Symmetry: C4
Subunit: 396 residues, 4 copies
């Protein structure tokens, strides 16, 4: 927590040089009442690399280290103190190689807090404005010298380098000399490239913007276009469509057994233990068993979703499996579907007299709303029951 | 159904303010014979938030609620009644924060009726025109004052703010003062950003436009480029290609067992019951069985597709499985493939003397057109037959 | 084959109207020595709809039929014969609704011959040029009338409507009147929209251009970045990389068992019969078996790929499975890897004394180049051998 | 290694013609003191096609060969020696068809060293600059003839053809004649097309730029948005999130059993042998077994990842499986979780008294950091142990 303020300070220092250096190459009337900030920022840039090594790499010559090395040394201040000429002063731009280090720091200190496409887009907008400043300083540099206030002759140059980079091109102020025209051609290429990069990053940002909502929309029309071929009845097709509308608006389209298959075994055990915690210590058949038994029955529960009105259990069937209610409600009717016995709710269960006995179903269990209930098969229970002899004697 | 007309009314009210307010900031000669519409619309905006709470959230200070709160209060009408000056009148634009609420309402009331990329594109076109109006009003505001009809001095400003935002840039009318030039730079940035967003949304809209037809086109060339490596004969390769052309033009490329695996168990049971309804109550071996038997044989049927001329059953083979015709036709030939016994059609079946007996095939069953027929294996039938003793005695 | 020439004729007729009608709205000095082509093309458009019904739909009021219906009737020729004025002549553009029918015909008569993105891009380029003609005619229409040759006053208008639609915007010739300026604003919107559609279709065309070569490139770096974490030796890692280079440059990256799983059972049987045809009728253990036996052993062969130098069979091992060579070569060495017994090639086999006997390996079988050989497990052979009693007696 | 220098020489020769030929069509005052380079380069182009056949195709009339054939012959030098006129000289551009051969050579000699989208983008930038030269030569050609230095009248033409292709369009220098205007329209179309191709390739380049980091970011929010529906506790949810942060920052998001399933059987055996090499020759139960035994136990090990504090083995449980530590550390506690017995590290193992015996767990094994350990089930060990009788007698 005390290296992040140092990274913010280094970002401020390099942003300071990025605004100041091409502005003082044009005007040498600056730098003279402003040298102490150069002193402070140069000491900061030369002292960052020991703190770049220690407390940053443990917790000096590399192909991914030398921009910071070339940015560290005071290659500037010699130019502005000794009045080096125009084709030789330009090496004071070597401090601008520091921005690669700040890019590479910012693309990992907050890379998973925010979207990687959005971070790249914001970094590109920052570099484009910060480069439009330098291009405006260059255009202001190679103008014919005339008496003009230093605000207005910068304002026209910045207006020109925004008109050229965004490819609008009013053409109200144009090149005159050939040495202006070569500079104009090369920044037309750079402006078209930057605007292509911006359109590419926005196209990569809004393409993946709705993927969960588009994948579900494709999966819901694949089933519909298939069942229209099979000449299905429209009522059942409407029931399937309202099932998918439920499954989108509750758990966002994702199937249960394919989400918690991407967890390892102890975390999947922990999630299933947290889910079926207030349910499994209620049945009067698993009481008195060990903790070894509950962890093995709790990993073989299978989720199903019954719509409103679906017959879970018909009276008079064979019947094999027990059902644990998790979210919805359900009702229990008689064999003639008239006399309501009772109503069940979440945290309860039904069908427990099927794991131990070969009796046929004794009632009709109809769903009321969407249920989201789990089930346990008789074969799976007796398969993982064969290795526990004490409960194998308990159920007999 | 009576809240949707209220949402349409609120959209009309906020669109009314979005057109009117920057137009009356430039011309104070309006608002005076037009105050009653302000009264009606302000009452509507201040009375929407009780109906935003009740009958909308049940069926007041939140980070996703405060734009509607700041849009609700009559922060306007005080400016236009008391003649507040130019840098202070601009807070009458706070009503324009209402558009966030209308965006968030419209992106969920009709989000699955239409395409989410198309909805975002239409909303962006709406916001771009509705913002081009305000930018034209701003450009018309900071002009040098001269006698000019109020239609033409708006028409040139709207022509300018469309020439700048779409990045054409004729340059026939340009900035003159510095305070115009700063405004021109900032809306050049906004225009390049909006046009990047439009190109990005169109690129995300037409990329996923043919996905079902492109996925099948990739799957049909992956098989062809693989079988060209194996040095396959061109006749069988042409038969595979016409198989995939059939499977595209009938059920749109999708495989049967991977479409109805994305349904839950009761809906998959209901779909299979609707498909094999007029077929399974015709065989003279499953008649007299229970409803528990039919629901378990109907879930283990496996679809296959035979091309025109494919040998389904050769006379003299071992033979294990029964076949149920669903869509196409098929013919039955003798052992020498000469004397046609009969012809079968949809709704019928063949091979029923293989589930119960160890006799060899008694004829040759050749397909005629594309068949789309289901089959049932003998091992699967006898596996799910072992738990039903009465039909296990019936077949003996 | 004789309806395609009629579709080409209808495309020529509607392209004729699309070039001619806005050009003759500006110049009424045409149409008079050119009426017979109108007669022929109008008869063609009114006679296409019986051939649109018969021999096209079997092999009259619908929401996808009425553009052809409105294009069929001679709503034109009345305007140009009776000299209808300017705001009323424009309904002669209703013939231009025929292009929807030609679009919908061309997007299905050759939809799978070529790429669906490329077809949409070419159709959009056609519509953009064909609309730039009409927009040029409109700009030429609402000019101030002056004596000027009819080639040059069209050439400047077409130059303007290409400068505006491609968003270059030289600005050398501009609007003058307000009624020109409104037309300029609306086609600036249309030009920005069309150029957004072109960039979107090119971005959707070149994104999926290399998918087979990019998917393999991702799969080859996922394995490398994983095995670099496990601290693997660089020699084996180089051998894995040259394996993937082989598997790209021969069968284009695709795995064998996931390509021919997307075929149905009879076509998969036919492909496996064509592959293992000149191989399986060579072993002296399957000779004398039936055709029922070969079709069941041929569906359980499993492909493996051995690199140059990989030990297939080590002398002295347990050994269970037989190997069928398909593409590469292999060599057979002794127990001390010195005395070469023989060399094998494609179409041959080795390890046949493992299906019938519990003897240990008798030699060392080293690969020489990449082999691409199939294998058959002993358990699978004896599992599908248990149901054939005669070969079960033959092998004993 | 000595054909790559020849390909570089041919690329240099065709780049030489691509710069020189349209520049000498405008100025016939060249070519005369510069013919010997034409002689050398023409001999190179006519002698490349024998080395294109031999040592390139083995290691003459084809639809993918004839551009090189038409580029080979000296169709030039006759024009510049005999002073052919303007509409007939243009066939000297046929040498420019050589660039297709260089494109097709470069798109395969270094196609998997670098990114296929990046290669296409760099090739398009090369072709766009190399075509902007020729378009500038054409614009310079059809100018009104006036005395002007040959550097400046080229510099304005290149400035114009960069202003038009990047769609900026200052409009400072414009067409004058109609024959200039037709050329301007056709290169406006070409410039809009090229800039659409550049934006499309950048949009296809930066879309797939972070796929491994975006796929993991989607998989980590799918689990979180699902477990928020199940009303899970925030502490376990934080533990799941830090698990996924570990699994990203170590092995880049990929699951173990789905990476080395995309290898064939001998390479998967070799990778597992390299991983479990310094581990399996340490247990005092597998010592004295054969090499046939180790290769079969080493293919059935299953990876699991325990977080810091997860109970691997609880004292008093049933217990079945043995665990092999690979990367992390683990600690062994007593039944009351107080007295630390020992600490284990990588290369070691625990739980070996579970494969042979039906005793219950004798301690508590808690993880300390992230472990990355493999396990072997008792049922799998005894299943692959049943076919080896000597170790089946050794364990008793
Ligand atoms: C290259 C700029 C053109 C330099 C041309 C030049 O040297 O002109 C002379 C004057 O130079 C002079 O006073 C000094 C001329 C150069 C002063 C302006 C420097 C422009 C730096 C732009 C870098 C972009 C930053 C990108 C950051 C991401 C005369
Ligand atoms: C966001 C908004 C940033 C806006 C920043 C505007 C800050 C500049 C302040 C401003 O309004 O601009 C002018 C100052 O001229 C000057 O030299 C100022 C020159 C400074 C350079 C301004 C360009 C940078 C804008 C970058 C915007 C990108 C953000 C997206 C107006 O002068 P003022 O009326 O006193 O009369 C001057 C007299 O000579 C004639 O009236
Ligand atoms: C900011 C606009 C520039 C305002 C500059 C300004 O205040 O000029 C004075 C006149 O102000 C005045 O009369 C009033 C000047 C401002 C009147 C025009 C307001 C422009 C509002 C644009 C909002 C976009 C809406 C986006 C909706 C999505 C002098
Ligand atoms: C869709 C189409 C919308 C077209 C809307 C056109 C409605 C405007 C009506 C119109 O044709 O425009 C002019 C009216 O000038 C005016 O002030 C009208 C100024 C109103 C502002 C119009 C610009 C909004 C256009 C937004 C289009 C975006 C849609 C995509 C013509 O005047 P009129 O010939 O009487 O002679 C005027 C005399 O002074 C010289 O002839
Ligand atoms: C709308 C065009 C503006 C029409 C304005 C107009 O009517 O002007 C009068 C002259 O009309 C006249 O002679 C006749 C004026 C209109 C003549 C030109 C028609 C333009 C048709 C463009 C359709 C695009 C085709 C798209 C095909 C895909 C005066
Ligand atoms: C592809 C290439 C298509 C090029 C088509 C060029 C065909 C036009 C023929 C042509 O070269 O254009 C002019 C004819 O002017 C005219 O009115 C011709 C006007 C016809 C309209 C031409 C514009 C359509 C171009 C669409 C291109 C898009 C394709 C991508 C030259 O006149 P010419 O030197 O005799 O002297 C005229 C005298 O008055 C002064 O020299
Ligand atoms: C087509 C260029 C227009 C040619 C028009 C023309 O022939 O003009 C005459 C002069 O021709 C002359 O001297 C000679 C006129 C043509 C000389 C310039 C040739 C332009 C070649 C551009 C090819 C692009 C290369 C693309 C490479 C990827 C008069
Ligand atoms: C990368 C950078 C490439 C820059 C290349 C610049 C090389 C050209 C050298 C240069 O600076 O350009 C002019 C030469 O004019 C000329 O004819 C030169 C004409 C040559 C054509 C130059 C255009 C190609 C630029 C392509 C850039 C694309 C790369 C992205 C300046 O003349 P100089 O001051 O002596 O005074 C001339 C006197 O008449 C008035 O001052
Ligand atoms: N008969 C009966 N069963 C009930 C009642 N309430 C819940 N159930 C459950 O409904 C189940 C349906 O018959 P089961 O044999 O599956 O076991 C039954 C009970 O577990 C009730 O009031 N009467
Ligand atoms: N009891 C005991 N077990 C240990 C010790 N160090 C490692 N272990 C392993 O811890 C395992 C836990 O009990 P096991 O029966 O699985 O087998 C035990 C040993 O293999 C130790 O000091 N004491």
């Amino acid at each position: 927590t005390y290296t992040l303020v140092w990274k913010v300070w280094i970002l401020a220092v390099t942003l300071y040089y990025a605004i100041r250096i091409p502005l003082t190459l044009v005007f040498p009337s600056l730098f003279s009442p402003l040298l102490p900030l150069d002193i402070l920022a140069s000491l900061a840039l030369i002292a960052d690399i020991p703190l770049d090594l220690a407390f940053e790499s443990r917790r000096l010559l590399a192909p991914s280290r030398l921009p910071d090395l070339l940015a560290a040394l005071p290659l500037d201040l010699l130019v502005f103190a000794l009045h080096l000429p125009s084709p030789l002063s330009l090496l004071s731009l070597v401090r601008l190689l520091k921005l690669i280090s700040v890019q590479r720091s910012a693309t990992r200190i907050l890379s998973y807090r925010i979207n990687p496409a959005l971070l790249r887009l914001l970094s590109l907008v920052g570099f484009i404005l910060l480069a439009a400043h330098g291009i405006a300083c260059g255009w202001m540099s190679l103008q014919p010298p005339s008496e003009n206030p230093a605000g207005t002759r910068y304002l026209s140059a910045f207006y020109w380098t925004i008109t050229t980079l965004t490819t609008i091109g009013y053409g109200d102020i144009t090149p005159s000399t050939p040495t202006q025209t070569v500079y104009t051609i090369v920044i037309e290429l750079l402006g078209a490239a930057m605007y292509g990069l911006v359109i590419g990053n926005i196209a990569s940002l809004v393409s993946k913007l709705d993927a969960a909502k588009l994948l579900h929309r494709e999966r819901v029309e694949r089933v519909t276009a298939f069942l229209s071929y099979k000449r299905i009845s429209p009522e059942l097709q409407r029931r399937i469509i309202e099932y998918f509308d439920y499954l989108w608006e509750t758990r966002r389209g994702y199937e249960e057994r394919e989400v918690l298959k991407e967890l390892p075994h102890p975390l999947r055990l922990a999630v299933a233990m947290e889910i079926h915690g207030d349910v499994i210590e209620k049945v009067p058949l698993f009481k008195g068993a060990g903790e070894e038994f509950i962890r093995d029955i709790i990993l073989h529960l299978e989720p199903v979703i019954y719509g409103p009105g679906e017959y879970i259990i018909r009276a008079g069937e064979m019947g094999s499996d027990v059902y644990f209610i998790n979210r919805g409600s359900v009702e229990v009717l008689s064999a003639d579907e008239k006399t309501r016995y009772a109503i069940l709710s979440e945290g309860q269960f039904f069908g427990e007299m099927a794991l131990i006995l070969r009796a046929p179903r004794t009632a009709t269990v109809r769903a009321r709303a969407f249920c989201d209930l789990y089930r346990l098969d008789k074969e799976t229970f007796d398969r993982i029951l064969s290795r526990y002899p004490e409960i194998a004697a308990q159920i007999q």
